[PDB]
Design a protein around this ligand. Structure first.
Ligand SMILES: [Ca+2]
Ligand SMILES: [Ca+2]
Length: 200
């Protein structure tokens, strides 16, 4: 009795990207830009703070593996100096928080390596993965995994809602966040999964 909750564009596969290591600079379809510190501008180009989708296939300089799922990942790049704030992706789901239910949110987090226009991509800004109900962060993984340049690791966030939880019936949400706590200050995400089961 482990059931999946649908997520739009959960693997960042829309839009299709043809060319090796190519990318978009606009918010991926199905997601919004989480921008609590106004770090990401409305109009983006390659070198502004931005987010978007990128193809990770044979030929890539970014990883010693391919995209965890499908062809593409979703990425967030922040140009401001470390400490300036955070930004990322948010998606509000149609599912609502239900009692006596354990939620498991999994997402693959990527620390790409390489060099872009003579700028080293070594280093990592840190990540946070959040599960929301309404405006409330129910549970989050703030940067617990060590992710070396060129690899992905799976973050797992869990939350159990009891019958007295104040946020029952509010819409579930997911945030994938660049913490901007190091350089090179970009990171990737892929393969967002949310499942439910009865509480322990
Ligand atoms: Ca994917
Ligand atoms: Ca890196």
């Amino acid at each position: 009795s482990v059931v999946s909750i649908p997520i739009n564009n959960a693997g960042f596969e829309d839009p299709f990207i043809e060319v090796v290591d190519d990318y978009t600079v606009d918010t991926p379809p199905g997601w919004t830009t989480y921008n609590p510190n106004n770090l990401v501008p409305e109009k983006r180009t390659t070198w502004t703070s931005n987010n978007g989708v990128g193809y990770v296939g044979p030929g890539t300089q970014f990883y010693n593996q391919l995209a965890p799922e499908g062809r593409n990942i979703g990425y967030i790049y922040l140009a401001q100096k470390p400490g300036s704030g955070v930004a990322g992706f948010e998606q509000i789901l149609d599912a609502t928080l239900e009692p006596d239910t354990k939620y498991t949110l999994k997402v693959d987090v990527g620390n790409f390596g390489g060099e872009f226009q003579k700028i080293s991509l070594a280093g990592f800004p840190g990540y946070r993965v959040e599960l929301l109900a309404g405006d409330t962060v129910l549970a989050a993984d703030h940067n617990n995994l060590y992710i070396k340049d060129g690899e992905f690791k799976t973050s797992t966030v869990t939350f159990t809602a009891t019958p007295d939880n104040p946020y029952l019936d509010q819409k579930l949400g997911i945030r994938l966040i660049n913490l901007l706590q190091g350089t090179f200050s970009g990171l990737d995400f892929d393969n967002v999964r949310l499942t439910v089961e009865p509480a322990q």
